[PDB]
Design a protein around this ligand. Structure first.
Ligand SMILES: C[C@@H](Oc1cc(-c2cnn(C3CCNCC3)c2)cnc1N)c1c(Cl)ccc(F)c1Cl
Length: 292
């Protein structure tokens, strides 16, 4: 059984909370490798499954995922309730995030003539703050996520009291121990996709892209550009334009996250400070989002 180290503390498969399989009931499904279900332990959970038809590396990958999420402890990182590894198919049990992933949420909850006031600027700033808080936790514990993106964040509920959390750590899992075409190039800084150099400032760049995703209400970054076109564009100093109706102060946080030199990019303490200032500024939060 592989070991995992986080914050200088080492854990093993023996440290995972094994929940008896008889206590777990699948309720309903919720494309990638494996399925996800809503389940009950009652305690409502999301259940990630490992296909019984998998390789040894798929097994090790699944195990490492369990170890990684079980060792985080922060309000903006999805909780792991436990695992069921002693029966097949193997399960990882997670906090049920009823709002689903952030990208889907943004696309489905866009303001529309039918839902004219579904979202406001403050909703978006709160999501940004939530994920930046999770990112700050990761930074201060020296963990590099490597794929901070809307598709990897989840919401606790659809409604106004929603909290956003980081939910998928597959890329970090892969690196901890795929192909070029699967690399999240549109979320990666130049030194990452060029030299394979990752630091805390890697996630700062990606967070800038997430911010663009949030304020675009769920558009794919770099509209109309392929991965290689983005690589060349960003390497040459190109950056995305502001999302439709994006307040200047918010776009300015994006452009600071996308500084070419990692040393010139803000850490997450500074990002949080700037997001908070935006939330205080009436001219920002009184700005109307586009209606489709
Ligand atoms: C592994 C899986 O986990 C969950 C998915 C979901 C989820 C996905 N979709 N939905 C919908 C269920 C029906 N109502 C709308 C949301 C809920 C909730 N909690 C989870 N822990 C997951 C998925 Cl599927 C996508 C992105 C993520 F970051 C994660 Cl971590």
């Amino acid at each position: 059984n592989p070991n995992y180290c986080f914050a200088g503390k080492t854990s093993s498969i023996s440290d995972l909370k094994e929940v008896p399989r008889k206590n777990i009931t699948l309720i309903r499904g919720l494309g990638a490798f494996g399925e996800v279900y809503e389940g009950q332990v009652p305690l409502q959970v999301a259940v990630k499954t490992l296909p019984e038809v998998c390789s040894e590396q798929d097994e090790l990958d699944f195990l490492m995922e369990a170890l990684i999420i079980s060792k985080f402890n922060h309000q903006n990182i999805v909780r792991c309730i436990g695992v069921s590894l002693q029966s097949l198919p193997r399960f990882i049990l997670m906090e049920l995030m009823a709002g689903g992933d952030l990208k889907s949420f943004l696309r489905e909850t866009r303001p529309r003539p039918s839902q004219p006031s579904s979202l406001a600027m403050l909703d978006l700033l709160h999501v940004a703050r939530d994920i930046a808080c999770g990112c700050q936790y990761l930074e201060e514990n020296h963990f590099i996520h490597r794929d901070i993106a809307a598709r990897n964040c989840l919401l606790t509920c659809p409604g106004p009291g929603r909290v956003a959390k980081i939910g998928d750590f597959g890329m970090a899992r892969d690196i901890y121990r795929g192909g070029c075409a699967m690399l999240p190039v549109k979320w990666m800084p130049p030194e990452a996709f060029m030299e394979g150099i990752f630091t805390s400032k890697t996630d700062t760049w990606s967070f800038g892209v997430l911010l663009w995703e949030i304020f675009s209400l769920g558009y794919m970054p770099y509209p109309s550009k392929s991965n290689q076109e983005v690589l060349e564009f960003v390497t040459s100093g190109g950056r995305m334009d502001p999302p439709k109706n994006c307040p200047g102060p918010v776009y300015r946080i994006m452009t600071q996250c996308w500084q070419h030199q990692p040393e010139d990019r803000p850490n997450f303490a500074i990002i949080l400070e700037r997001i908070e200032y935006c939330t205080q500024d009436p001219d920002v939060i009184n700005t109307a989002l586009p209606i489709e």
